[PDB]
Write a protein that binds this ligand. Sequence first.
Ligand SMILES: [Mg+2]
Lengths: 263, 49, 97, 49, 99, 98, 49, 49, 49
Amino acid sequence: ELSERGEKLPAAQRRDMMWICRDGDRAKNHLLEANLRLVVSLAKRYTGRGMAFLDLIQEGNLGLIRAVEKFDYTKGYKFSTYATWWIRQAITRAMADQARTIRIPVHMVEVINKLGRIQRELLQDLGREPTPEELAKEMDITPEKVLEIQQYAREPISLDQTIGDEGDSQLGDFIEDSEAVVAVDAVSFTLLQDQLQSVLDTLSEREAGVVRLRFGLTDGQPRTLDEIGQVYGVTRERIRQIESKTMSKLRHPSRSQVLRDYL
Amino acid sequence: WLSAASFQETTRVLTDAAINCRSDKLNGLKENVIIGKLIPAGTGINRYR
Amino acid sequence: LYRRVINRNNRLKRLIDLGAPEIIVNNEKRMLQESVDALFDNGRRGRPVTGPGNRPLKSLSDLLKGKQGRFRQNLLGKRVDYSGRSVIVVGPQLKLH
Amino acid sequence: KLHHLVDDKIHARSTGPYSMITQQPLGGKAQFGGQRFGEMECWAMQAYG
Amino acid sequence: VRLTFADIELDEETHEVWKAGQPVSLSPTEFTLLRYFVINAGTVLSKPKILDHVWRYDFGGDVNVVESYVSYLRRKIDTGEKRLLHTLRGVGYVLREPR
Amino acid sequence: SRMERVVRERMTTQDVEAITPQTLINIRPVVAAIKEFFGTSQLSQFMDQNNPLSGLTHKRRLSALGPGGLSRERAGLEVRDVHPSHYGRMCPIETPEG
Amino acid sequence: APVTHIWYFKGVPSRLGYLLDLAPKDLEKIIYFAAYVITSVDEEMRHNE
Amino acid sequence: EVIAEHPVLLNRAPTLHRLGIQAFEPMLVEGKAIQLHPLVCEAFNADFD
Amino acid sequence: RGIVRIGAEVRDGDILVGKVTPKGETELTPEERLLRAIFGEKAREVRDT
DNA sequence: TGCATCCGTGAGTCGAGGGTAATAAGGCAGATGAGATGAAGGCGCCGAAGGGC
DNA sequence: GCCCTTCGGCGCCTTCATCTCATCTGCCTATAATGGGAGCTGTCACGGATGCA
Ligand SMILES: [Mg+2]
């Protein structure tokens, strides 16, 4: 308030004010460092899944950092009681959106957690694995969504773990590269292109060009009739007629047998 | 450095070569085998190639 | 490992921008150093960073070391096409060539 | 008769699939395979000239 | 050879539809969309490959055309808010009798 | 041990006389442990059965590798040898050539 | 914040320790936040003061 | 028809010396067993177990 | 039902179960369009894996 | 200056053999891009047929 | 026997708005709750820092 819309700070209103500012700073730091023991104690029950121990400790430290600002002493409860809720919130949020290789929104990691807890609570009471329809009855939602969430929660595996009983090879050695070119269908495609060129050249040149730019062979884009008219000085009905002539002559078994084989 | 790094103590020789800014000639046997060039022996020399 | 590096870096950025006591900042910087450590060479310092199944993770260095490293497994000797394999049987009626 | 019959022991390929990271063909009978041409055979081929 | 599904029925010759036994007149391209739906009954339909196969590959328009056409299919045969022609967010549509 | 840890955690977080053994018990780790043992463990392996003798010899076989054992790289020359105490206990002939 | 490459800090010779005339036992204490170092000193500001 | 004078290499792991890879000329044979000339066994260190 | 009759002989390459998967979408080659235009073949919107 | 003390390197060739797990988390406000709607314009296509050379 | 050139008719085909339906992101919960689970290490040889004394 005194920096913008203020005045030249006097002796007693600048140094003392900055001193109480720093005093509050070190007081906050002091209680924070004193209460990190609570964070590290609470993080013990939270390890064993997703993230490491020290990462959880650090996230709890951030949660306590946030909590100390909103802590109200005037309400007259111990600081630990208020800080525990914020620490738990920070840890849960971090484990939700940070502990997964495939990140999952919290809004539905919540329902994965609830599905797991209800299924494992009902398993011991009923003695058997809970069928997903009964789980859906406990969900008040359609079972199909239950199978969907069940298959969403599945986490990825490692490509480099040894797969055999004896250690000799990794998983990644047994996965085929789908994106690789077949090296057989490529030559087939080239010869098919050659056959198409021969067939089109056998046809009349106007028809060959019309169909070539109709299906976008020589260029990247097939074109509508009006483009064909503008490039050949004819109406679009004439182009429809010449296209009719094209596939009429193309049904000729001389071309039909020689090209149909290529499949 | 390319030949040495592929024989033994890969990290050590790799670090040493990085420090020394060693410029490999890509002229030896194993280097040409690695990079796909003709090996400098037998039918790979310029007299016969 | 890259996810761990990213998480530690982002949390350190948050700590610095927010303003935190120097102990937490030092702890985060140590975690960043150890995370880059694990990324470049897992298990070189301290216990190796472990994932699921309780096995050491494969860092960049482990991908260039030993028999299973790239150098002596994919560069020096490669699986080749146009090849086969079968049991051998004596051919006493064959010619030497 | 032992369980090492030649029918389950003959394998050959012209152009099969390939691995992801490196474009080398895979190995084994379940996959289309491809024999490993290791560095020890590289020694022999280099010695031949 | 007439293709049937629940209460919609199609004759491949004269390009008309019966909805619960009532004949209905419908637009040609809209009819092609319905033909795709019946020819892939029980399989989900996505706007792209719908555009790829049914529509010409030269189509330079926006994406609202297919949504509007589905709206016409709804108002012609499946007038109910819940309808046999279910819609998937980001994955398109599907012809399916609701469970 | 996992059971004891989880029940020790739970017995305090709940008020007295409102706590029952069923809610103290969560049998998940026990079945998880037995499933961990029976599958993806190298000491409980796929039965080698292509004749009655192979089935007979797969059981009643003494192994040395696995959890608590020594790996082949970890194995020295002394262990692979035949001890004089092997007589009558473990056959000195039947052992794989690999 | 900057970090140190392990290949150079940690090894049979600690290359960073060799260049900076220290020991790896006297470097892990610093690049892992256990002990401080004196980056620079003011010589004249101490000689006159 | 196509195997007319087309050389084909034969190898046996482990390939100790240079003669562990030999180029022959193949003749079509029934069955599924590669027929090796009995003389080149010693060079191959090959045996029919 | 889509599977081989019981007591029927098969060999390498013969189909065993007819399982058809929705192919989704891909780049339909223009040459494919001319191919269907010559014979009247349907698009066959599914993949025969 | 020893001198134990450790600390990082090396240790085979092709082939049987595929994947294993916890926990207190819940309303609530806003927003946001996808998809549901309705309305209006720019030809299509004909429904008529003009007509003659 | 059909080209040159018509009004218009709703259709239809887009396209502009313009509304909802999930879907996802940030915020708040007050008795007290205050310092790791577990890890099993040891082949064989061989060059080199190394903490002290
Ligand atoms: Mg032999």
